[PDB]
Design a protein around this ligand. Structure first.
Ligand SMILES: O=P(O)(O)OC[C@H]1O[C@@H](O)[C@@H](O)[C@@H](O)[C@@H]1O
Ligand SMILES: O=P(O)(O)OC[C@H]1O[C@@H](O)[C@@H](O)[C@@H](O)[C@@H]1O
Ligand SMILES: *[C@@H]1O[C@H](CO)[C@@H](O)[C@H](O)[C@H]1NC(C)=O
Ligand SMILES: *[C@@H]1O[C@H](CO)[C@@H](O)[C@H](O)[C@H]1NC(C)=O
Ligand SMILES: [Mn+2]
Ligand SMILES: [Mn+2]
Lengths: 148, 151
């Protein structure tokens, strides 16, 4: 299984399919947040990032008790690009219980161009959980694949 | 009138409210860019939290057909979303005019990626692309530079 885009299989956006193809070299990799807090984050491109076979593309692990929360699933992927960046979004994460109208969590990853690395510097920016809807966890990473 | 964020008054995001305040210096400005070839040549006009249309439609970004001057609303500022990263700000206007034959006839949407540029308050507004080949979540993408996106 890989990233699933909106639309029927084989009928998805050619623009999105092309971007997934471009990021293929990153599928085998795993990315983890730094700083050594309370939560750690693990992110993968179109592959299982969690340890519970939940279909997670990005997970949040609470350090004190090992709780793994799915932030976004790769079976609900959106991907687009600009001049020197690529935005990847995984929807369908575990539902909130007291924020955001109890909607499913979502992960938004901004990949910026960096000619010096295939991929690195992955880290969370912030979590927007103060809205009535359309909340999300925001992350950033660098990759030469985002360059033009 | 100004940008309206999701949620009733008092239930809006503290982060979005602060970002909205930060963008104030851009409100008085207007941006334009002409792209495409006839009969599909368009003039895109964009404004931050202010009317961009030549008529009171509440448009934040409009697409003008150069052949007849007809305006199509890409996004309305009464449906604004704004967030920022380390050296960029993303602004989204939903509620544009509905597609008639694409994207399940959903309302158009404008996505503007504002990148940091320490040399200008705002410049280089440029239409990037239009995604109208999906069953949902279609959008028009634009880019622009602004020192306000610098951290
Ligand atoms: O589920 P509620 O009670 O709304 O709490 C929401 C919070 O849960 C924690 O376990 C983390 O996942 C936080 O990032 C999240 O914002
Ligand atoms: O309205 P339909 O028939 O779906 O066509 C959609 C197209 O219309 C044109 O006037 C422009 O606004 C294009 O950017 C848009 O993609
Ligand atoms: C994605 O997977 C989850 C978990 O099995 C499921 O609940 C959801 O319906 C799936 N969404 C899609 C794209 O069908
Ligand atoms: C956006 O403005 C239009 C124009 O009247 C309106 O139909 C729509 O309800 C507004 N969206 C919101 C946030 O209610
Ligand atoms: Mn909870
Ligand atoms: Mn039409």
């Amino acid at each position: 299984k890989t990233c699933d885009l909106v639309g029927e299989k084989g009928k998805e956006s050619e623009k999105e399919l092309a971007l997934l193809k471009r990021l293929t070299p990153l599928f085998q990799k795993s990315f983890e947040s730094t700083v050594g807090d309370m939560y750690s984050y693990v992110f993968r491109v179109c592959r299982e990032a969690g340890q519970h076979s939940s279909g997670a593309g990005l997970v949040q692990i609470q350090k004190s008790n090992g709780k793994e929360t799915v932030v976004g699933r790769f079976n609900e992927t959106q991907i687009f690009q600009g001049s020197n960046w690529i935005m990847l979004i995984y929807k369908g994460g575990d539902e909130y219980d007291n924020h955001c109208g109890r909607e499913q969590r979502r992960a938004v990853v901004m990949i910026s161009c960096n000619r010096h690395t295939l991929a690195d510097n992955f880290n969370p920016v912030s979590e927007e959980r103060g809205k009535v809807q359309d909340c999300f966890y925001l992350f950033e990473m660098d990759s030469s694949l985002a360059c033009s």
